[PDB]
Amino acid sequence: GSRNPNKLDINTLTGEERVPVVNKRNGKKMGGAMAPPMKDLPRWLEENPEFAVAPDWTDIVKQSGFVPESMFDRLLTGPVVRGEGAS
């Protein structure tokens, strides 16, 4: 029950892509629907201190050019919490 970029053409990061964000505390994960847009990630992030960007989006967003390297700290390193349907 998640939305990974394993099948999302990373070329659409021209500012329109919907970068998925995962909450650090509760693990709230949001693919692109409710997630922030590449060209606004820095705004949405600054607005959501409890949220971060998905692991594969840490690298993608990193290259995004829209997010500042100083914000890469919230881009995650790899692991994230997302269940709903497992145990």
From Swiss-Prot:
Distribution of this protein across tissues and organs: Widely expressed in fetal and adult tissues.
Resulting phenotype, R74C:
In CHARGES; uncertain significance
Q: Which domain of life is it from?
A: Eukaryota
Kindly state the subunit structure of this protein: May interact with CTCF. Interacts with CHD8. Interacts with FAM124B. Found in a complex composed of AGO2, CHD7 and ARB2A. Interacts with TLK2.
UniProt family annotation: Belongs to the SNF2/RAD54 helicase family.
The record's function comment reads: ATP-dependent chromatin-remodeling factor, slides nucleosomes along DNA; nucleosome sliding requires ATP. Probable transcription regulator. May be involved in the in 45S precursor rRNA production.
Give the linked disease: CHARGE syndrome: Common cause of congenital anomalies. Is characterized by a non-random pattern of congenital anomalies including choanal atresia and malformations of the heart, inner ear, and retina. Idiopathic scoliosis 3: An abnormality of the vertebral column in which patients develop lateral curvature of the spine of at least 10 degrees.
Q: What is this protein called?
A: Chromodomain-helicase-DNA-binding protein 7
Q: What organism does the record attribute this protein to?
A: Homo sapiens
